[PDB]
């Protein structure tokens, strides 16, 4: 049903600063960071490796607070 989340479009290594090429929008469950926030996430770092196809959750991004 409608809410899309940010999903990793490639493996994102631990401590990588996110770029736009790394983030796609997809309706997945459980729900992660809202896809509307992809602009806000560029150049923030992930604190763990995020495999291809993994939903980005709030606790995986350093400094994220919505």
Q: In Å, how far are 2, 3, 23, 29, 41 from 16, measured between CA atoms?
A: 29, 26, 13, 24, 12
Domain count, the chain: 1
What DSSP assignment string belongs to 1-66?
----EEEESS-B-TTPBP-GGGEEEE--SS--SBGGGHHHHTTPBBSS-B-TTPBPPGGGBTT---
Q: What is the C-alpha separation between 50 and 47, in angstroms, rounded?
A: 9
15 class by beta-carbon count within 10 Å (0-12 exposed, 13-18 middle, 19+ buried): exposed
> Tokens for 10?
């490639």
Experimental method: X-ray
CATH number at residue 14: 3.90.1210.10
Cα–chain-centroid distance for residue 40?
11
Range of the domain at 20: 1-66
**Residue 14: both structure tokens together:** 């631990």
Of 31, 38, 36, whose CA–CA distance to 1 is shortest? Answer: 31
Distance, in Å, from the CA atom of 27 to the CA atom of 23, rounded to the nearest integer, reads 13
């Amino acid at each position: 049903a409608n809410q899309a989340s940010v999903v990793a479009n490639q493996l994102i290594p631990i401590n990588t600063a996110l770029t736009l090429a790394m983030m796609r929008s997809e309706v997945v469950t459980p729900v992660g960071i809202p896809a509307e926030d992809i602009p806000r996430l560029v150049s923030m770092q992930v604190n763990r490796a995020v495999p291809l196809g993994t939903t980005l959750m709030p606790d995986m991004v350093k400094g994220y607070a919505a």
